[PDB]
Amino acid sequence: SGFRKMAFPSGKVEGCMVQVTCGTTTLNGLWLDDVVYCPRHVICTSEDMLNPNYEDLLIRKSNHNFLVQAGNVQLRVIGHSMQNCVLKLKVDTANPKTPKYKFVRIQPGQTFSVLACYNGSPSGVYQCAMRPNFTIKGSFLNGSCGSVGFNIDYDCVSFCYMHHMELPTGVHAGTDLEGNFYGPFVDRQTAQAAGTDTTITVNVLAWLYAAVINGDRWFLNRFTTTLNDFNLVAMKYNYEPLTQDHVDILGPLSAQTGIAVLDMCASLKELLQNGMNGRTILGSALLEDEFTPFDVVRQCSGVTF
Amino acid sequence: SGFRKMAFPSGKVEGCMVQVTCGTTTLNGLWLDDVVYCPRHVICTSEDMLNPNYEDLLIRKSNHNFLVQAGNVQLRVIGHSMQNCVLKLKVDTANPKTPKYKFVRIQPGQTFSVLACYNGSPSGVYQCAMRPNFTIKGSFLNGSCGSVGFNIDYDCVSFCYMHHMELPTGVHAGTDLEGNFYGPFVDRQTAQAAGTDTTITVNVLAWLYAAVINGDRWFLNRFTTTLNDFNLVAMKYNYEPLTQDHVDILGPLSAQTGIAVLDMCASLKELLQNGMNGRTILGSALLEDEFTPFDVVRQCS
Ligand SMILES: O=C1C[C@H](NC(=O)[C@@H]2CCOc3ccc(Cl)cc32)CCN1
Ligand SMILES: O=C1C[C@H](NC(=O)[C@@H]2CCOc3ccc(Cl)cc32)CCN1
Ligand SMILES: [Cl-]
Ligand SMILES: [Cl-]
């Protein structure tokens, strides 16, 4: 029993974290095979960040301008290139701790574990979701750039996020490992704001199933709803639309608990219209949306890596 | 910026997790140097669960009755001994992945990361607090026994918990790595209940300081309180007494935010009286108590 916000075991990623220094800036890099990936803004001064021409800033750098440290060992940089907003530093040594990995771009609503790092040293691991507005509600201080987000599927690490910046509201923005930003953000010190966010409906439903599995049923009711009537309610309360794909994805949890997806939607509609009435669900007075249906199944079944 | 429930990176502990089998039972072990630590109840059969005589059950076992698997390699058990409720299996190979470590027994209110494991394989990492009633609100299924709790301040892993059992309310009980249970629990399936749990007051105050550091001040007020008046009110909401030790511990956070500890206590008294009125504090509609003063400073600074 119990239901916790759980991250993947971070060991496979810890063995890839390195420190990258370019001039006065130090941030984190991800060392996989003979390449170290890091945010391209590592080459910027504070003034350059106002309006950077990354090609112009990069052409002026030599390999020796990048200092890469893996633990207490210096990695020799033998090449450098840019891919979108990520800098790729070719090093003279393949990482012997390179796990089986892939680079995957995730969609809003998908969750992943973040290994927060400072000076190439992992400091913490936490689970988060890619918000519908393409930000993540992370926990990052100065020096955390280059920290990565990932999932594990069997023994393969799927890297999905690299940290680049914090927006004025305290939320975070970054890219996939191919350097493409999630959201309409740019790597520049300019006025940028996260758009109005919405709740990840399919994830709230998955967490309501987790609550039922854990013995919390007070919110269940005799009612059902149509997908169109539910979506009219979801739009009203800034919840993301629930698609037939989401309904299909929740099928296994619906079969396990005996609560149809549209039956659980009727519980959610009532919760949105009435509140919790002083009650909690899984120790929360808010509807949690950072557990996917796969996370709930994995946690309530015990999948290992 | 941001404030998340954050666990320590689990890699150093993942390299220590092994599978221990004794007869029909399989659970997790912690392999450090040439010793594998696991719950002594791994030697119990279905008839031993209520009143096991562990000394009597253990004397009947030979080294080859314990199968220890580290990855796809069987380690050879060359000795065994019991220390309180933990079984220590001497193996023929020192773990090459043994990190710098220590065993620490923690106090209620302390937090730690749990690496949940099944069949010697890590499945997830989460953050826990040792509740005032000496249970933990973990997430554990059958096969999770032997999973450990730890902290990693610097490069040294301090192991503080080994999972043994789940109580009827769905909360968890275990021991330190010397095999001493936290709380009045025993490794017997006899009727056991967690005592009434309470909120970790010092941790709630630490988290209110974290909220102020992160830019939120809506809950502050122009009042202060005496420590005794605060305790009289807080106990009515099932909050733990706040001691002068706790006030002293919150000193650094008080100096950083400019909010005196007893001033923050008055905010807490008001929150207990009024609730949040549709507002949240650090993305929560409840008062969070599983961040210690040390956690807040580490995460914010
Ligand atoms: O999550 C974090 C990282 C954050 N650092 C940035 O946001 C840098 C410096 C500011 O100006 C910018 C502007 C753009 C870019 Cl890509 C990065 C940055 C410091 C606080 N925590
Ligand atoms: O992970 C689990 C949990 C549970 N295991 C116990 O109940 C053990 C069995 C042996 O006899 C005992 C005796 C005492 C104690 Cl604390 C535990 C136990 C059922 C099987 N799986
Ligand atoms: Cl599924
Ligand atoms: Cl302690």
Convert chain A into a string of H (helix), E (strand) and C (coil).
CCCCCCECCCHHHHCCEEEEEECCEEEEEEEECCEEEEEHHHHCCCCHHHCCCHHHHHHCCCHHHEEEEECCEEECEEEEEEECCEEEEEECCCCCCCCEEEECCCCCCCEEEEEEEECCEEEEEEEEECCCCCCECCCCCCCCCCCEEEEEECCEEEEEEEEEEECCCCCEEEECCCCCECCCCCCCCCCCCCCCCCECHHHHHHHHHHHHHCCCCCCCCCCCCCHHHHHHHHHHCCECCCCHHHHHHCHHHHHHHCCCHHHHHHHHHHHHHHCCCCCCECCECCCCCCCCHHHHHHHCCCCCC
Q: How far apart are the first and last CA of chain B?
A: 10
Task: Name the fold adopted by A1-14+100-197.
Answer: Thrombin, subunit H (2.40.10)
Residue B210, classed as helix, strand or coil, is helix
Residues of A in contact with B4 (CB under 8 A): 126, 128, 137-139
Give resolution, Å, one decimal.
Answer: 1.6
Q: Give the count of alpha carbons within 13 A of B263, CB side only.
A: 14
Residue B77, classed as helix, strand or coil, is strand
Q: What are the residues whose beta carbons fall under 8 Å from the beta carbon of B222, sequence distance 6 or more?
A: none
The correct answer on CATH 3.20.20.70 for the domain covering A15-99 is: no
Q: How far is A155 from chain B (nearest CA, A)?
A: 11
CB contact under 8 A, A6 and B124: yes
CB contact under 8 A, A214 and B10: no
Residue B217, classed as helix, strand or coil, is coil
Point out the ligand 1 atom lying closest to the alpha carbon of residue A85.
16
CB contact under 8 A, B125 and A286: no
Q: Which residues line ligand 1 (CB under 6 A)?
A: A 41, 49, 140-142, 144-145, 164-166, 172, 187-189
Strands A100-103 and A156-166: parallel
Task: Identify the experimental approach.
Answer: X-ray
Q: What are the residues whose beta carbons fall under 8 Å from the beta carbon of A264, sequence distance 6 or more?
A: A205, A208, A209, A250, A254
Cα–Cα distances (Å) from B201 to A61, B206, B230, in that order, read: 53, 9, 11
Separation CA A120–CA A238 (nearest Å): 39
Separation CA A252–CA A292 (nearest Å): 13
Residue B36, classed as helix, strand or coil, is strand
Q: Phi and psi (nearest 5°) for A132? A: -55, -25
Point out the ligand 2 atom lying closest to the alpha carbon of residue B48.
11
Contact status, residue A39 vs residue A89, Cβ threshold 8 Å:
no
Contact status, residue A35 vs residue A90, Cβ threshold 8 Å:
yes
The best mutation among B46, B49, B142 to test binding of ligand 2, ranked by most ligand atoms within 8 Å of the C-beta, falls on: B49
Contact status, residue B175 vs residue B164, Cβ threshold 8 Å:
yes
Task: Order across the sheet with A25-32: list the strands.
Answer: A73-75, A66-70, A17-22, A25-32, A35-39, A86-91, A77-83
- Count CB atoms within 10 A of the CB of residue B59: 9
Q: Phi and psi (nearest 5°) for A84? A: 55, -125
Instruction: Calculate Rg over the CA atoms of chain B.
Output: 21
The best mutation among B53, B56, B189 to test binding of ligand 2, ranked by most ligand atoms within 8 Å of the C-beta, falls on: B189
CB contact under 8 A, A214 and B122: no
Separation CA A208–CA A217 (nearest Å): 9
Burial class (CB in 10 A: 0-12, 13-18, 19+), B244: exposed
Set B128, B145, B160, B265: catalytic member: B145
Nearest-CA neighbor of B177 among B11, B29, B71? B29
Contact status, residue A99 vs residue A51, Cβ threshold 8 Å:
no
Nearest-CA neighbor of A257 among A296, A284, A203, A229? A296
Query: What separation in Å is there between the alpha carbon of A280 and the centre of ligand 4?
Result: 29
Residue B265, classed as helix, strand or coil, is helix
Set A16, A22, A38, A41: catalytic member: A41
Contact status, residue A22 vs residue A68, Cβ threshold 8 Å:
no
Q: What are the residues whose beta carbons fall under 8 Å from the beta carbon of B180, sequence distance 6 or more?
A: B84, B85, B105
Burial class (CB in 10 A: 0-12, 13-18, 19+), A67: middle
Please list all protein residues whose beta carbon sits less than 5 angstroms from ligand 3, which is an ion: A 252, 297
Residue B159, classed as helix, strand or coil, is strand
> Across chain A, which distance is largest between two alpha carbons, in Å?
68
The correct answer on CATH 1.10.1840.10 for the domain covering A198-301 is: yes
Q: What are the residues whose beta carbons fall under 8 Å from the beta carbon of A101, sequence distance 6 or more?
A: A32, A156, A157, A158, A159
Ligand nearest to the CA of B42: 2
Q: Is B145 tagged catalytic?
A: yes
Separation CA A154–CA A34 (nearest Å): 24
Separation CA A99–CA A14 (nearest Å): 10
Nearest-CA neighbor of A3 among A224, A287, A207? A207
- Ligand 2 proximity of B49 Cβ (cutoff 6 Å): yes
Residue B19, classed as helix, strand or coil, is strand
DSSP 8-state secondary structure symbol assigned to residue B64: G
Sign of CA pseudo-dihedral A45, A47, A49, A53: negative
Nearest-CA neighbor of A233 among A280, A195, A196, A265? A265
Cα angle B224, B230, B232 (rounded to 5 degrees) comes to 150
Comma-separated ranges of CATH 2.40.10.10 domains in chain A: 1-14+100-197, 15-99
What own/partner pairs with CB < 8 Å and gap ≥ 24 does A246-249 have?
A: A246/A201, A246/A202, A246/A205, A249/A202, A249/A293
Picking from A121, A139, A301 by the largest number of B CB atoms within 10 A of its own CB, the best residue to mutate is A139
Which of A14, A124, A303 minimises the CB distance to B6? A124
